Amino acid sequence: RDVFEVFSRDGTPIRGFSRPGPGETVVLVHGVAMDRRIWAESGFLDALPDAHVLALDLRGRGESGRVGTAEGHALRRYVEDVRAVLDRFGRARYSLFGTFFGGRIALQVAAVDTRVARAFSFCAHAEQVEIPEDAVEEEAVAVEGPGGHAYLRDHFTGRGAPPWMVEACARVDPGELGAATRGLLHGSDRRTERGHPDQELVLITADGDADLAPFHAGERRLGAHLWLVDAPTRIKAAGRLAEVGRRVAGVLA
Numbered sequence: 329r330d331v332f333e334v335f336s337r338d339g340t341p342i343r344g345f346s347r348p349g350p351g352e353t354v355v356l357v358h359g360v361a362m363d364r365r366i367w368a369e370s371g372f373l374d375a376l377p378d379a380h381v382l383a384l385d386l387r388g389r390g391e392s393g394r395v396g397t398a399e400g401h402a403l404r405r406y407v408e409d410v411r412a413v414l415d416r417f418g419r420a421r422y423s424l425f426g427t428f429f430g431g432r433i434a435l436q437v438a439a440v441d442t443r444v445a446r447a448f449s450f451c452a453h454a455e456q457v458e459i460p461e462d463a464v465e466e467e468a469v470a471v472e473g474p475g476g477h478a479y480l481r482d483h484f485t486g487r488g489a490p491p492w493m494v495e496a497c498a499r500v501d502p503g504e505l506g507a508a509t510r511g512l513l514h515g516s517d518r519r520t521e522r523g524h525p526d527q528e529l530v531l532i533t534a535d536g537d538a539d540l541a542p543f544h545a546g547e548r549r550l551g552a553h554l555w556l557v558d559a560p561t562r563i564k565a566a567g568r569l570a571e572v573g574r575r576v577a578g579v580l581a
């Protein structure tokens with residue numbers, strides 16, 4: 329792997345790795361309490377042996393610049409972070425894959441960037457969501473304080489998350505956990521749109537998801553394809569991420 333840095337629209341440095349390959353260029357977008365190490369740890373990366381893989385750390389996570397404000401964590405800023413990565417590698421065609429909120433990011437990048445030929449959203453749908461201000465602020469307080477990593481660890485353990493997902497939370501600065509959480513009140517509630525007719529949009533979730541309605545809504549509204557994995561919940565579906573990688577590799581082939 330090679331490392332890269334790019335600068336987002338607002339000056340934030342965005343750092344990542346490039347794993348060269350002869351195949352399609354795939355850009356990987358992690359979730360809120362994660363960093364780019366999840367792709368190797370989950371087995372997703374080994375499922376794409378031929379692809380040119382680009383994996384960034386979103387702002388405030390991993391090796392990328394610190395933010396520390398809620399508006400700095402607005403959805404539009406993460407979209408700018410990903411588009412900067414698309415600029416550095418100069419391709420006309422990219423396939424994006426995002427986990428959890430990273431899926432929402434990938435969908436929004438697809439809406440605005442005609443270089444995105446495919447976008448895959450793992451365990452996130454594309455529809456409008458009502459965000460309860462009070463509960464999100466409460467969660468920001470929990471995650472940003474001294475007990476914040478333990479709060480997330482305990483929650484994800486108790487819901488059967490894979491170990492890599494449990495462990496990743498402790499690698500995120502508590503101040504950025506709080507700011508990213510508050511950032512969800514700045515634009516993340518809106519639905520995403522289709523960027524252009526030829527785009528391939530894929531949503532992935534647990535067959536046991538308690539709320540499949542918005543996933544079906546995306547099939548209808550966006551012409552998205554819905555992929556199911558065997559799991560009772562979205563968190564547990566993350567145990568199937570390597571398997572999903574193999575299915576992505578079948579599309580890219």
Ligand SMILES: COC(=O)C[C@@H](NC(=O)[C@@H](NC(=O)[C@@H](/N=C1/NCC(=O)N2CC[C@@H](C)[C@H]2C(=O)N[C@@H](C(C)C)C(=O)N[C@H]1C(C)(C)C)C(C)(C)C)[C@@H](C)c1ccccc1)c1nccs1
Nearest residue numbers: 360361428429452459460463464467483509512516562563
């Ligand atoms: C139903 O969702 C689940 O089954 C768990 C699942 N979450 C999500 O799919 C989505 N979100 C949510 O549904 C709600 N949102 C929350 N908090 C905002 C939020 O998400 N976070 C703040 C901390 C950060 C780790 C992240 C998170 O995970 N928090 C958990 C908490 C229980 C540990 C958490 O969901 N809390 C809740 C409350 C309200 C209880 C505080 C909502 C409807 C208000 C948007 C994410 C992907 C998203 C955010 C914005 C736009 C669209 C989607 C995940 N499992 C692992 C990673 S994401």
